[PDB]
Amino acid sequence: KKISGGSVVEMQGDEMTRIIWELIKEKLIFPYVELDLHSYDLGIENRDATNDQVTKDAAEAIKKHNVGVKCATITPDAARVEEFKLKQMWKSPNGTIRNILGGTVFREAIICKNIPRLVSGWVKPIIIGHHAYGDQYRATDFVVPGPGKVEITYTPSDGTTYLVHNFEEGGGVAMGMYNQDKSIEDFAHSSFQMALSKGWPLYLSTKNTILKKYDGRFKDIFQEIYDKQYKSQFAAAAIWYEHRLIDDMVAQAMKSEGGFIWACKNYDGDVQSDSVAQGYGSLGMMTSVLVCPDGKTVEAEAAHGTVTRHYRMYQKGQETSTNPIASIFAWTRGLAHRAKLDNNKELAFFANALEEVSIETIEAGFMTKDLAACIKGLPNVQRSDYLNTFEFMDKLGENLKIKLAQAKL
């Protein structure tokens, strides 16, 4: 009687996001869907026990089945190394998975009509992605004690040098970088595939720098792959591609209506943080998806962390108000991609239905505390203005069952 969903790689997480992960699976997914679920436990304890092998196994699983949904994990530091008595300070799992699959991360904010945004003029979505390290890119730096010269060199592997400074007085710091064309091509392919997947135009952002020969490369690569492999595909989808230099891109974007993909490029180390900033809107309403340049493999993930403070409240038995939208949308976007790969329209209908239910619920006046403060301001919110974690999950469950019952008339 349930829907046959297919094969999905699951990755479990830590702390509060773990609690809510199991809530979602028990209340919103399994009652209506039957899955071929390949579950990997990326909790800090298990990762320590397997010496981080479980992370790699999960990554390869995603490489095999093309669909992965991940719960927020912990990136250990010294403090954590003490808390759990870890063997090593284990690397961030997100970076490992990303390095294995080789895609690009794109982040998005879920829009509700009664939730104010950073710019009031924004109506439509905005989806942002950065070209970060990993790769096939890498870099290095070091300090310089005193007078000397720093020079760069290149030794061809098949049978055969510049200068950056010959300074005299004073010390300093030197740095060198390399960037394969492959990472540029993968970044471009992933961007185009994302814009086609969403049906929005694509803008590429770039700085004006002294590194001219390097600046022109991103240009010519994006533009060429476009002219050769996506011109007509974009024509048929009524979307387009353009380049902007970021100084203009930011201003123009701030007085646009939204509705575009933003591929951000800084001609240096951008790195890829596990989470997005903090002051651009509620983090519970922000998602991320890792898209590979082949357009077939996808990893869905909440764009925030494990919410440690709330977990501390939960351990001591106190009332929490944690926003589950981002994780829910990890599940719904994963399942949606599954449906596209399988041409399973039941699954697609269910996923879009669950997203509609979440947005409708919040817009009807039922929300967690973070959104209530987002409306009024935290020094003005009262208890009657919001619902706790479990209350909100129950509300979502009710409204979902209702919508599905209506659809079956």
Ligand X SMILES: NC(=O)C1=CN([C@@H]2O[C@H](COP(=O)(O)OP(=O)(O)OC[C@H]3O[C@@H](n4cnc5c(N)ncnc54)[C@H](OP(=O)(O)O)[C@@H]3O)[C@@H](O)[C@H]2O)C=CC1
Ligand Y SMILES: CC(C)CCOc1nc(N2C[C@@H]3[C@H](C2)[C@H]3C(=O)O)ccc1C(=O)N[C@@H]1[C@@H]2C[C@@H]3C[C@H]1C[C@@](O)(C3)C2
- Tokens found for residue 380: 């003005």
Site string for a second copy, 234-263 (x = CB under 8 A): -------------xx--xx-xx--------
Nearer to a second copy, 2 or 182 (CB): 182
Region of 88-96, 143-151, 165-173, 243-251 interacting with ligand Y (CB under 6 A): 243-251
Cis, peptide link before residue 88, omega less than 30° from 0:
no
Is 283 an interacting residue with respect to ligand X (CB under 6 A)? yes
Neighbours of 210 (CB within 10 A): 7
Residue pointed to by tokens 């970021």: 246
Is 281 an interacting residue with respect to ligand Y (CB under 6 A)? yes
Interstrand relation of 260-264 and 202-206 (parallel, antiparallel or unpaired): parallel
- Tokens found for residue 239: 């979307």
Residue list 221-250, contact with ligand X (CB under 6 A):
none
Is 89 an interacting residue with respect to a second copy (CB under 8 A)? no
Neighbours of 379 (CB within 10 A): 6
Residue from 307, 328, 393, 396 in contact with ligand X (CB under 6 A)? 307
Whole-angstrom CA distances from 47 to 20, 22, 58 are: 20, 19, 11
Is 359 an interacting residue with respect to ligand Y (CB under 6 A)? no
Site string for ligand Y, 116-145 (x = CB under 6 A): -xx---x--xx-x-----------------
Nearer to ligand Y, 58 or 285 (CB): 285
Nearer to a second copy, 211 or 407 (CB): 211
Partner whose binding site includes residue 143, from ligand X, a second copy, ligand Y, none (CB under 5 to 8 Å by kind): a second copy
DSSP secondary structure code for residue 157 in this structure:
S
Nearer to ligand Y, 233 or 275 (CB): 275
Residue list 136-155, contact with a second copy (CB under 8 A):
136, 138-155
Nearer to ligand Y, 105 or 184 (CB): 105
- Tokens found for residue 50: 């397997």
Residue list 164-183, contact with ligand X (CB under 6 A):
none
Query: Quick one: which H or E segment has residue 384?
Result: none
Task: Please check whether residue 317 is in contact with residue 357, taking contact to mean a CB–CB distance below 8 angstroms.
Answer: no
Partner whose binding site includes residue 82, from ligand X, ligand Y, a second copy, none (CB under 5 to 8 Å by kind): none
Main-chain phi, psi angles of 92, to 5 degrees: -55, 130
Main-chain phi, psi angles of 85, to 5 degrees: 55, 65
Q: Is 404 exposed, middle or buried (0-12, 13-18, 19+ CB in 10 A)?
A: middle
Minimum distance between the CB of residue 304 and ligand X, rounded to whole angstroms?
A: 4
Task: Please check whether residue 32 is in contact with residue 353, taking contact to mean a CB–CB distance below 8 angstroms.
Answer: no
How many residues line the site for ligand X (CB under 6 A)? 19
User: CA dihedral in degrees (237, 243, 246, 248; nearest 10)?
Assistant: -90
Q: How far is it, in rounded angstroms, from Cα 393 to Cα 385?
A: 16
Residue from 28, 74, 194, 195 in contact with ligand X (CB under 6 A)? 74
Partner whose binding site includes residue 274, from a second copy, ligand X, ligand Y, none (CB under 5 to 8 Å by kind): ligand X
Partner whose binding site includes residue 283, from a second copy, ligand X, ligand Y, none (CB under 5 to 8 Å by kind): ligand X
Residue among 104, 95, 100, 98 nearest 187 (CA): 104
Q: How far is it, in rounded angstroms, from Cα 91 to Cα 367?
A: 35
Between CA 129 and CA 139, with CA 135 as vertex, the angle to 5 degrees is: 100
Task: List strand residue ranges (DSSP E) for 200-252, in order.
Answer: 202-206, 241-245
Residue from 8, 276, 354, 400 in contact with ligand Y (CB under 6 A)? 276
Residue from 73, 193, 205, 297 in contact with ligand X (CB under 6 A)? 73
Is 264 an interacting residue with respect to ligand Y (CB under 6 A)? yes
Residue among 144, 147, 108 nearest 127 (CA): 108
Binding site for ligand Y (CB under 6 A): 109, 117-118, 122, 125-126, 128, 246-247, 250, 253-254, 264, 276-277, 280-281
Instruction: Catalog residues that contact ligand X under the rule CB under 6 A.
Output: 72-75, 94, 274-275, 283-284, 301, 304-309, 322-323, 370
Q: Which residues bind a second copy (CB under 8 A)?
A: 118, 133, 136, 138-158, 162-165, 167-168, 170-182, 207-214, 217, 247-248, 251-252, 254-255, 266-271, 273, 277-280
